[PDB]
Amino acid sequence: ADLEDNMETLNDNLKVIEKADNAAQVKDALTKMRAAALDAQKATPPKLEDKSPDSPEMWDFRHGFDILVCQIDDALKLANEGKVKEAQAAAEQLKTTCNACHQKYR
Amino acid sequence: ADLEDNMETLNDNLKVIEKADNAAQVKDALTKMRAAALDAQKATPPKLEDKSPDSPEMWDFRHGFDILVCQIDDALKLANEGKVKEAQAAAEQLKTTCNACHQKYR
Ligand code: HEM
Ligand code: HEM
Ligand SMILES: CC(=O)Nc1ccc(O)c2ncccc12
Ligand SMILES: CC(=O)Nc1ccc(O)c2ncccc12
Ligand code: NI
Structure with missing residues (x-):
């Protein structure tokens, strides 16, 4: 997938993690995030x-x-x-990295 | 110590490691290298x-x-x-890093 597609996956699975009810939900999301990154x-x-x-x-x-x-x-x-x-x-804390790279190269 | 001083420590403790007879000798040298780095x-x-x-x-x-x-x-x-x-x-393998940084900034 292109950079844009991957970034959307990352962005969308962050909220998904922010709404998760259980662990399995967080794991799935994070697994999708890892791959896209x-x-x-x-x-x-x-x-x-x-x-x-x-x-x-x-x-x-x-x-x-x-x-x-x-x-x-x-x-x-x-x-x-x-x-x-x-x-x-831990998921939220990821935004630090996200932002950091965004203001330099996005 | 200045950059030059530290680099000499690194450079000299590499040969020292390259001549070492025992572990204790390698550890000392490496410990001095870590600090200087x-x-x-x-x-x-x-x-x-x-x-x-x-x-x-x-x-x-x-x-x-x-x-x-x-x-x-x-x-x-x-x-x-x-x-x-x-x-x-492992000590030798460090040269890769050394060189890498040298050709870009030295
Ligand atoms: C962190 C987990 C993270 C998120 C979340 C994220 C989101 C994101 C969005 C919403 C965009 C918009 C893309 C679009 O047009 O649909 C975007 C764009 C870029 N990003 Fe990103 N991003 C996160 C992390 C990272 C990291 C760690 C880097 C750098 C290694 C990075 C880089 C970029 C770049 C470049 C863009 C722009 C892409 C383009 O303009 O085509 N992102 N990100
Ligand atoms: C790796 C373990 C390593 C060695 C060994 C090493 C040696 C070295 C020498 C011999 C010099 C000459 C310095 C002098 O004038 O006496 C030198 C110079 C620089 N180096 Fe170095 N160096 C090693 C590693 C690294 C690493 C990993 C970096 C980068 C992070 C680095 C950088 C530099 C720079 C800059 C100089 C020049 C300093 C100056 O010109 O004042 N070295 N190094
Ligand atoms: C989890 C974490 O903060 N990792 C890292 C921090 C700093 C770095 O320079 C890294 N480099 C390569 C791989 C991971 C790195
Ligand atoms: C032993 C080793 O190779 N370490 C590392 C490799 C690559 C990195 O980006 C690192 N970043 C921060 C600290 C250590 C790093
Ligand atoms: Ni690193």
């Missing part, structure tokens, strides 16, 4: 079509996703432990 | 005095050290396990 990692944002592929901006763009995935896996660990409330909190 | 992380290379402190180049410069420290800790884990030969091998 990895796939997004491969795209080249429109604001970096120029910059060479090995550009320092690009590496920061891709590195942004390794942080999101690490964060996402921690949320899954929590969801896996039945701690639904803090798996949700 | 962290301290180096704070300096601003001469080729980045201009670029703003929050510059994408700077963050890559500092991030370079988080990789070196992670690598260094893995070497210590190995040295801690008595595996002197592979703690040494």
